Symmetry: D2
Subunit: 237 residues, 4 copies
Amino acid sequence: ADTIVAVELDTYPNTDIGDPSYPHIGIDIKSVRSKKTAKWNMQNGKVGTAHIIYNSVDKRLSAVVSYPNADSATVSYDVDLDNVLPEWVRVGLSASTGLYKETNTILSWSFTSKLKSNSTHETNALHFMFNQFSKDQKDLILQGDATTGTDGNLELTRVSSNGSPQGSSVGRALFYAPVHIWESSAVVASFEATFTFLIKSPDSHPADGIAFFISNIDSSIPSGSTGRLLGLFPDAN
Amino acid sequence: ADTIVAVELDTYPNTDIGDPSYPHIGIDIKSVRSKKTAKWNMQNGKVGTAHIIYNSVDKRLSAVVSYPNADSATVSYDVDLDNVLPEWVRVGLSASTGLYKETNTILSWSFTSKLKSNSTHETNALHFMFNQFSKDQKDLILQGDATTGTDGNLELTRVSSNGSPQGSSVGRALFYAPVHIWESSAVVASFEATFTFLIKSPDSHPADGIAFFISNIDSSIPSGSTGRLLGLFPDAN
Amino acid sequence: ADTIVAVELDTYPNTDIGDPSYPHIGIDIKSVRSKKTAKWNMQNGKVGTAHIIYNSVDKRLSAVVSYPNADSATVSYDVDLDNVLPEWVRVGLSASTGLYKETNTILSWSFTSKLKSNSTHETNALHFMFNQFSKDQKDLILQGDATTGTDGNLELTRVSSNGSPQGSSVGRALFYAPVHIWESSAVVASFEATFTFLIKSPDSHPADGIAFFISNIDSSIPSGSTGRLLGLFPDAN
Amino acid sequence: ADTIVAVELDTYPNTDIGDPSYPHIGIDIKSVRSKKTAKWNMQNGKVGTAHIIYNSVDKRLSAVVSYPNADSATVSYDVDLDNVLPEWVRVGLSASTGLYKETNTILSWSFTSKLKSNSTHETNALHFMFNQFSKDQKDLILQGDATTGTDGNLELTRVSSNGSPQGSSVGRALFYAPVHIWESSAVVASFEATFTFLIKSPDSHPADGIAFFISNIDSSIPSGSTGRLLGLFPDAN
Ligand SMILES: [Ca+2]
Ligand SMILES: [Ca+2]
Ligand SMILES: [Ca+2]
Ligand SMILES: [Ca+2]
Ligand SMILES: [Mn+2]
Ligand SMILES: [Mn+2]
Ligand SMILES: [Mn+2]
Ligand SMILES: [Mn+2]
């Protein structure tokens, strides 16, 4: 039902469904089986940063993930989003845990989209930036186990009182306002997203990951999408 | 019921309710009877621009209106918005006509709000800019007679096929996402709004005006607020 | 001597040096003989807009040129600017006329460059926007025949009192501050430039064109670069 | 000679020249004897943040300084900068030490100035943001003992190898490009500056302070302005 385009930070290798045998970043177009992936040297307990960029002229979705003092990981995929997504969409973050677990903490999130028309100086834009989340964040649609306010952070999946991450959890956060990514008179459409995250697990095998995604405006968590499905897909096809 | 703070571009002098005897700009705090006004040399048929600014440190709401090749008009009022408005609000534009009429056309509208916390680099922001409006503008809540899409503009009040403005009309447009204007750990909160408009009337006496406003998130057009009430207030108290 | 990367809006076809037989937009890497070009339906006397974009992840320089009510023209070229340009550069606009002529008027110009480091939230940026130019624009380095202030515009090449464009003219405008386009710890570097222009000629054959360019910081107009050389190259190799 | 407007973070009370008897923030208009001050609970060794704002409509220069987990300090002063400063100016940071000392480390610095003209959509802007400084920062004019690059920070005054601050030191950093703060057709001019700093001293009595300042473009450090004069004034009048 839902149309999903996402950049996944996959912490657990499910080789039975196409994941490489190591943590990786990937670009998912309507399927959890990434169209392209790159090895990611994930660091348990460290704050990392992900940057996602795209523009309608080049038609290439690219993402870069890094941690301080370390080399980055990058992945790119040629795709025309006009042919995949509706004209109006919502953007958000999703995460899940299953048998294995980890905290999926978001410390900041910014997004900027621009539509440049052929009229002189005619440019439409939307920009939001969160460097702190409140208990009652009215401009976010929280789904599943996601909550905001703990230490000013956004916890996508369940975490107990003692800070311990729970398994079989799924949660998403979408920006309240729909986003216009295509318009008939637009000559250039582009967006850039950045978010900082903290994945921590008491185990040697963290799971399952975090994903930045773009979807139809009325998207909701598919049934049974905990674990390897990242709260984004109904199955592994 | 609704809590309204607005900057009015009042084209018709209703001296019976406190308006000066000439077109004017004014700052309205919960009442159509402006707390402060300034003479405005309105130009029928010309595109004008309004700028509104405010910050929590100075606690002064100021507005400047101008037309190309002409001197500007300015008005300021000392007011602490924390004591007037809720923590979360919606921002929008409103306009009305009555016995007398005019077109209340909006050609562009931008808004920027920032909340700077005491945490290092911790800053929250929201920014939107419309330089063109679509027939189906999903990020705007249109109320009353307001419509978008005609020539890429936002028509706040009714206009016939031949471009002729109708009387007894009222319409408003609010940005879809709620806006956070106060937070317990914020050291500075501020906003700036800019919109360009085209007020045109076939008559020597245009009415009633356009207003930029901030209100509780669930605000709706009060009954009988056409004409002198600008689609904002239930009465003239 | 100078290292030049430029996007040319070439109005005169010099087929003897590789130009296609029609006005065109092209990407020039250290040579006036464009690495790639696209047909451009230039409109004499109309205000057009050019958008240039690039990022270090995709390594693709793309440009889009358009006029109101018309289809756009686009050109892209895969090039790693790190391998062509110095770490610090200046950005500017250049134009020329020769035997044939045209006005090379710039009405607005904006530029944004960003360097995102691997440190958390660590981002460096520079942004400038001119929608009007003054007689004494201290933040611009004017070279050759370029002047600012006439009607608030930037005239890159000589125009007489009666508004008539002169031949054999060359002029450039560079932003005063050097721009940092590469840094050892940067994970993503990108820039976007936009400018609106008005090319008008009394003749059926306008020449020679306008170019947005990036160069070493101490770049100056090469001798004899009027005409087909666009004020950028010392010869046609 | 120089014309200086500055916001001082004064760490040492020189009661003989008008300082209150405690660390304080103040607004200086052409004199080290602040026109207005506010008590500042300075924290040795902690990273603080200063925000400075001003606009031509309200004509009020305000500043807010804070540290994480602490209440802020604010100071405001009504002043028309058009009557004090030239049309073109440079903005920068200055610091000094004398008999007493401290490190005057700047970790980030951002600035935004805007000039809104009465022409439709006509807006000029300049924005820069440094979250990291390089050894060779070509867009900064360093004066005196100021250096960049150590740990990616800007050290305004001398610090030895072991990280120990030196006395009798003075240094300033100015952004390379001049800034336009007034224009004949501007209806609103405004600026906002933010910088984060780390003042650390091995002594119970740190000195002398850091100041954000605006000056004539060719400003240089006055002779003998170490110590209480903050590298800004030639004497204490
Ligand atoms: Ca997986
Ligand atoms: Ca009235
Ligand atoms: Ca040519
Ligand atoms: Ca002192
Ligand atoms: Mn995967
Ligand atoms: Mn009124
Ligand atoms: Mn060519
Ligand atoms: Mn003092």
